[PDB]
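the two lines:
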Amino acid sequence: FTAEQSELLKAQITSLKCLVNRKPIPFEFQAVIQKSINHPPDFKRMLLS
Amino acid sequence: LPTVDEQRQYKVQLLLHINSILLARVIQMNNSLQNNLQNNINNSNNNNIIRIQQLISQFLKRVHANLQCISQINQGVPSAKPLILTPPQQDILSKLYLLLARVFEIW
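prediction for all of em together
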């Protein structure tokens, strides 16, 4: 479980908490999530399957 | 020739990526709901307000289901599968949920 994956995981858990508690998501986690969006996994090799 | 370890890494990556898109969409709709509540009229009788809240609920249910599946996958739980394999409600989320369903059918 890579360091980047673990970094995204905690950003997502925190954001979910903040959301369900009607709290703002601290900006560091939004950037982690935006990074995730802009660097998607290799869906192609997943297609080779 | 995808090993079990590669399959598992693919599953985690795809669940994480879908979560990021879901979460980003919720932040968008929430900002939109907040502006709508502040700027609109007759918000006692505004169906759009309820429908956005319901939609946000659908997205957040999926984020939770995907988080728990990641957690089970990391724990080595055999045949871990997301409790929700449909998209909420050209659209990238819908293509990725189809791929998600296929991954958890074939692996």
